[PDB]
Paper text:
Eukaryotic ribosome biogenesis is a complex, tightly regulated process that involves many ribosome biogenesis factors and spans different cellular compartments. Here, we answer these questions and reveal how the nascent 60S moves from chromatin to the late-assembly compartment in the nucleolus of [name] ([name]). In vitro, Fkbp39 binds DNA and nucleosomes but dissociates to bind nascent 60S particles and to partition them from chromatin through LLPS. This partitioning provides directionality for the nascent 60S to move into the nucleophosmin-rich GC, where its biogenesis continues.
Author numbering:
A (entry chain G): 69 to 120, 125 to 235
B (entry chain o): 103 to 238
C (entry chain m): 213 to 256
D (entry chain K): 5 to 29, 41 to 262
E (entry chain t): 50 to 72
F (entry chain D): 312 to 425, 435 to 534
The structure:
Amino acid sequence: LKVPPAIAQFQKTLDKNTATQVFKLLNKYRPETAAEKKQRLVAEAEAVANGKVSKKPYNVKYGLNHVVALIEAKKAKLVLIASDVDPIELVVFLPALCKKMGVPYAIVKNKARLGTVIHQKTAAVLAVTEVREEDKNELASIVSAVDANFSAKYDESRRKWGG
Amino acid sequence: KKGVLYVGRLPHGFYEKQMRMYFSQFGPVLRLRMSRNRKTGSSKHYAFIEFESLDVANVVAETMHNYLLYGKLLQCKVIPEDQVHENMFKGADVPFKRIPHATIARLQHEKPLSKEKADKLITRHNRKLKLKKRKL
Amino acid sequence: TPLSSAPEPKRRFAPSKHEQKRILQLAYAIRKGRILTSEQRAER
Amino acid sequence: ELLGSDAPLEKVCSALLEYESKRKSNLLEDEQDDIEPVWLQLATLKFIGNNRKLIPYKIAIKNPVIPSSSEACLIVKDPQRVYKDLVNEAGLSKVVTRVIGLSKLKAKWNSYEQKRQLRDQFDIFLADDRVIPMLPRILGKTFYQKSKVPVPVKISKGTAEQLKREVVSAYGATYFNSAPCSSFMIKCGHVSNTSTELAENVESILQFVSKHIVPDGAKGIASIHLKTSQSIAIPLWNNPNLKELIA
Amino acid sequence: TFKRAETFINNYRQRERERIRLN
Amino acid sequence: EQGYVVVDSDKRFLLLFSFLKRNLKKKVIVFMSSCASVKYMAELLNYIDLPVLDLHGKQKQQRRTNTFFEFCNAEKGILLCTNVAARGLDIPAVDWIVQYDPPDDPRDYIHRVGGKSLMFLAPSELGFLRYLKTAKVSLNEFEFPANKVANVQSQLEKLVSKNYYLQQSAKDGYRSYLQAYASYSLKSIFDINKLDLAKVAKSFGFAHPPNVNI
RNA sequence: ACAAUCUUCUCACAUGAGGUGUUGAACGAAAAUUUAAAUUUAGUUUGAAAUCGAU
């Protein structure tokens, strides 16, 4: 059946090769699991108790409201959108906002893969804002790859009434 | 006919034999011409390789084009038949085995010259020095 | 330009006060023996 | 005197300096103290080098060639805080513009553009002797070939006096990397150097070349010529016994 | 099963490194 | 007599930093269009190991007089102040005088000058050069090769995002720069619409413009 | 299985010797050499850029 172009985007997801390369980078900046965060904090509690400067955390940013506001501030370098969100109403505007703010973005396959990155069951969207200087040159590669396999590719197919 | 192809932005270390094997996995290559320096033999990462079948090249190009391999986007573009030439097919599927030119010059320098050869080697060196003096 | 006209707060540049609160009450539980310490955890 | 039982210096240097000055022929925003470098071409009867060596020779000279205003970048082993603290303690802030650890330098900056930017961000590049061999890697032709030969400064002691002496020695010594050839070119200084200073610097370089560079010393040397960046290579000295040595 | 190109380049770089390491 | 350099807005800040680096051992004074800019640049330069005196301090008039007086006896140094900051003050013997932002009183600028003078102008605001023709004031141009201009921009914006107070100074200075530019009189010479906001934001240390209400 | 061993220093007595590893393409100055091509090599450009040129 005929489909609006606002929903037709989510059928033309990211390719197999590039999506793996996104996740390979993301896996370096997974958020700390609640377990070791308890262990990491208790190390500082013990240091405070007996007797006594850190650095900024570097991870991926997740959550629908969190990610939208990072885009609306143009703090997001890369947005990744799960193609099979339960009520599709949740991210049908995200490609529009991500194009409006000039934030490169890609519609990746499955939401459980993104959830595993953030130690959650399901992650509806992820955003990469800050990356350590070691991988700064690496990130610019995928942004070009997304710009080549999602923006150069499709583009016109993003506007056609799907189905 | 032959599937002339000329990929771009080939990642470093993509050996021509390795590239041919990877390409042959998708489809056999009629020509496997690889770029190299005139003397150094250093490849320019130009995969000007002609496939066995023109249609096979198109199918291979569609998958290979814009593939992020080793951090570089595989800009695989099928070379047009008009663009492909006999000189382009010249040197295809051949290794650019470079002899040790640096050692050859060193060996030639180390090569002994007889008294007559040394005089022949000198030749007009005094005249050249006189010519240099005349220029000065 | 962004949309957030509001000025950037102090939280995003200072060490987190969420853990600094959690750290303090963890020192509470360490001092009074409520929770086993890290060195106690290893030997236990 | 040691080269060919004669010292045709000074007068040759003065004549070259006069010729360079004679051959003279907005800029406020493009003003610099750059001067015409003095390049000396030395001819030997045998191959001085057999393989490329990416290590400049610390040819100490009385008159330094590198301007003191040049920013010096030091590459030292981890941790960087210890090396940075010693640099601050020694007061080499105006000399040591930035010190980059070996692990940090190789990892943080890897791209050709980033390496090129870092290469042009420092006028003088210096490397610690502990990790001097790694300089050819993580730099590539963007440094090794683009006129960036790190100075092998010995800073393993981690002493302020040792660092100051090494920094002063590096500033006062010319740089020249040995490569496989029977000939070599050495930068003897700039046009601003005095004729006597240029002659003294040339003699020290020639003495150093015959000592630690030329396998046969003065005997293997065939001819010596000196010139500017565009001047003619006037032959400072030629071996008179080279005819018998060649045979 | 099909083989990805980057798999072979890994082998190529290993061969170059091994020759240097054994040199 | 008036010297001008055709410099783009993005490279405007970078060029001046290089200019101060080359002439560190000379007496230089830079005029900009904002007191907030004066605070920002002075804080920024002193934070990148470039000690610079300024006419802002803690917004204390006594400090401004003391700083101005100290610069008078000092044969070398770099000072920052606005057009109104030096409006009426006696200009001492200074080797280098520079107007960073376009003056809000062009007819007072020509009267004030009447060392050597420098103009920092965008490539899209050359109408001021034609204004000098109508002013019957001689002029000259100074060229600069962009290769030797230091690209510390990679480290600059990174420090701004990392630091808080430095960031707040930049945005307030950026907002004051845009408002002062919007408050200009010679609209046929300096137009806010013609100037590219993205390039201006790059000069302040921002990769992206901050969201300032007009 | 886009994962692998490119050394974060050694030996001899503050001194000597040693560490064998470098993207590609394009632009370009004049030198010393070796038996016309070959070695070194000023000074630059660049998205780890690329569409024949292999000697």
